[PDB]
């Protein structure tokens, strides 16, 4: 049908998202390992 | 009868819209996340210079 070419086009659209989700949440990751990078430099920087 | 088939496919259409439009977000999401990532960067490059 219609529907079972309309639901295939979601569906591919659907992992699409879920692999975008967990892209953000990796980068996420990330800026917390540079935010604690920071701190280790900053407190490093405060012993002058 | 073919109403009902008219509302069925204008269902799924929007459904499939709503997730195209959900895909478009997260990539724009994606792009903020890496200009953040961007600007931690130089920020670490910055105090990393100040510590020499």
Redesign the interface.
């Known amino acids: 049908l219609?529907?079972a070419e309309?639901?295939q086009?979601?569906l591919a659209?659907?992992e699409?998202?879920q692999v975008?989700?967990m892209?953000?949440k990796r980068?996420?990751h990330?800026?917390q390992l540079?935010?604690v990078?920071?701190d280790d430099?900053?407190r490093?920087?405060q012993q002058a």
């Open positions: 219609q529907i309309k639901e086009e979601l659209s659907q699409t998202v975008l989700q892209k953000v980068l996420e990330l800026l540079k935010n990078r920071i430099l900053s490093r920087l």
